[PDB]
Amino acid sequence: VFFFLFLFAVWMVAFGVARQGILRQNEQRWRWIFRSVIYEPYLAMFGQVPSDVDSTTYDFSHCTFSGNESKPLCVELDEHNLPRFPEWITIPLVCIYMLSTNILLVNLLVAMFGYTVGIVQENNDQVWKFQRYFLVQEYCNRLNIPFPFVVFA
Amino acid sequence: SYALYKAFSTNEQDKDNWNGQLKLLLEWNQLDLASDEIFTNDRRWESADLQEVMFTALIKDRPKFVRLFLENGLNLQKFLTNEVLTELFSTHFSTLVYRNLQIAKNSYNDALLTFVWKLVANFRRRHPLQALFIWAILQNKKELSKVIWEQTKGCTLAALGASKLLKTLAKVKNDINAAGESEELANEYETRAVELFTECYSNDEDLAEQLLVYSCEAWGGSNCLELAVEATDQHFIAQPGVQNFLSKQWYGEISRDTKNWKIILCLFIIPLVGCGLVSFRKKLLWYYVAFFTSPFVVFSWNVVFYIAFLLLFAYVLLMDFHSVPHTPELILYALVFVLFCDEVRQWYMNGVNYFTDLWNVMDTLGLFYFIAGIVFRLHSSNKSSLYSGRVIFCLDYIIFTLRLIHIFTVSRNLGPKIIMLQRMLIDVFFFLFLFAVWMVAFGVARQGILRQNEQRWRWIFRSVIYEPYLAMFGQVPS
Amino acid sequence: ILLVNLLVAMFGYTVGIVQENNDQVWKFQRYFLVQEYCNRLNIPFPFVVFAYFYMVVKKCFKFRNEDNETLAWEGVMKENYLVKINTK
Amino acid sequence: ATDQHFIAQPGVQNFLSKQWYGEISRDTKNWKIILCLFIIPLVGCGLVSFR
Amino acid sequence: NFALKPRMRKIFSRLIYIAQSKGAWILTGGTHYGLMKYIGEVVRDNTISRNSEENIVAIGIAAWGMVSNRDTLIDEGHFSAYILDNNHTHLLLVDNGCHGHPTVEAKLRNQLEKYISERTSQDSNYGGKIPIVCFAQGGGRETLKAINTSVKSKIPCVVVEGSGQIADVIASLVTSSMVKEKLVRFLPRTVSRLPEEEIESWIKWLKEILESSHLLTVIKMEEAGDEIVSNAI
């Protein structure tokens, strides 16, 4: 689990900072930095495909133009009031990130879980019945009545 | 042979002819008879008259007789002159073996094979036993080689160099039978080197670590540990002696039986070096320097520096990036210049093999993209060049961040799994091959059934490649 | 479904093979990091460039008996190892 | 007879690989071969081995 | 010259290991030729393998009449080319007359053996007395004269093997006729160069050998495992 979280955090930070830097310009709000760098590439692990990279399915009614209300900033515009970002640099970026995290990195965790279950099973019964000692010696040690009356004792 | 020896001995003229009896028992394989009634009486031994019979026992594959001759006494280095070596490598050297040596030097070239090609070019036109060992080991003699190997001084170096030569010669594709025997003899000598060094370590640690670092006065121009590395003999390094050597060399002055959290806790609080928390076994300023010299803590300081560099890069790129460089951008250029100094140091101290590793290639490429982003970035009052400079820095940040995976391969826990990660490329490529074939087939079929004569290339590649690609993550094309 | 769950199976089989070799390959790779962090005389990192100027200072200006003793030591365990081989 | 163990042995596999590369020797690398494939008049150079 | 087969090689390697484990002197000839070469080799090897814990003591006792290069000093010498052996840590060379005189050192050697055999050192397990063992393996007149001077003296503890030249002729029989029969059957090429006026003397030598059969022992052929030298001594 920790090896999975290490690799996923590295890919998540790299893609999040690259996408936030290519799209927008000089965000000054910390909450909308950490929603757009950490949170949305995190949701792309459950099959979300981060949205505002396409430049044809992007509307300007979810922006602020300056941070005044809740919504994110717009992508920084042109002198013709067009989005500046190349689709040919952000569509394959999302495709590589989405392949690398949603498919390769989860199905590697499946393989490592399967191998660990394959190792530890002939030892698992031994470790369980070794742990059995502690519960027997905590439920056979005290002179114990049933529970909600124990405080009287 | 016994009948001929009984006829030769009882002539009552040649009973003084021990040379004729010895040559007759050499032409046949009578070892036991020559041991029982030639070398028994201690009556007449000259110890230098045994030379032509030695040359014959070498060229006719008589390992038991040369064992008997060295058992009764002969000096190899006195015997083995340059004329003997030219007669061996010139006349008694095979011609199919030389063709396989040509093919191996042409297609599988290396440092040790360039060295042995130079010495075999020397002797077909000063460490003599090693050259005779190379002659016997190339020929796949397999039993004279052991007899000379028992007489050598640098035995572990000889076994590792022989294993390297034979693992290289076992890759030549014609005459696969000779490749098979050379492979088996390679495995035998690498087993021999491992089993000798584990004894040399299990008696004494200090003199075994003395053995590991010697170059034998240009044996092949390299070291025992270097020959184990260059042959990819990972079983020689996966043994506890070399691993104990490496761990003791890695912690530096700090003893190995201290816990790691004490070490990093003393790392963060710098004047804490003067306390009884760490053990320096393996006045006060010596504790200070013996802490701050070790590879462990200079590595850990270096990775703390690299994480702080990534945080500064991210701050500059996302929150403070204007038409003129402010103060943290200039601090960022300073830190990138420091990394560039380290990389040109490593290119200086390695040379041309520096470009062998892929990490150094993408490392130099990332520095190139950084200075290209600088030369796009300084053209102020031009918004397009400034935006293009920031996009260049973003892709360069991707590269710098993904270097951190290669950084953390040294760990006891994450390390083996990161090394395991590069064995998956053939499965990933098989997946991508089948998925690309299905994706192209469905995309062209759907675009052809639905629409009619699209003339825009972008809306061809959005509707053929991109939407069937998204249907891998559960989209169901609409 | 089919093509992704086949990749899962091939990953699981490759992890099943390479694990008893993985520790060997890791501690073989350990040599290179130790020999790049033990070779140079290295101070901690952001000051190293100053030491680079020290090497510029260089460009501003510019048979053994214990070896035979330890090889003679090696020969004794070689003889003991040959005794052990023939003892088996 | 579907006796695949008789064909999975190195003798018949060596026969088949030597019959598959044709005139080119087997101990040349594949990238030289496809590089000489794309550049057609490159056949006259010392890059491939016809043993 | 001497044949160094791996059985005698193993025996003398084990012997020098026992002499290192017990802290014993080893008395020998001390010339460069033959067996003393191998004894100096194994002394040098057991010295070079441990370098501490009672570095062993080998005394070569030579005649001074067979040494080729001799230096008269007070001033260390540099002896190079009988030749003296390189690795014996102590040497004693007896003074006598001219050059061609073998069997000179044997008198002082046997008298030194007798004196340490009568020397009392109570810090042991032998009731003092510093126990002394003589070894014979090969052949010659010096061997037989040394064995008889030992067995005439007290505490000889003579040990022989079951391979050699005279070790075979002593090992096989344990009157005059059987001595003749063994000496002609195990030494075929020595009897031709011998007058019988001293062959009868050798018969008297061996009859003085076999008087005390409790002071003599042998290493056999079936007994060929490990720690057979300790089981003999």
Ligand SMILES: O=C1NC(c2cccc([N+](=O)[O-])c2)=CCN1c1ccccc1O
């Ligand atoms: O020395 C280093 N140089 C670079 C580097 C330097 C310049 C450019 C790039 N790059 O773009 O990938 C990388 C990578 C990280 N790194 C490092 C730091 C601490 C521990 C281990 C390490 O390898």
Ligand SMILES: [Ca+2]
């Ligand atoms: Ca580098």
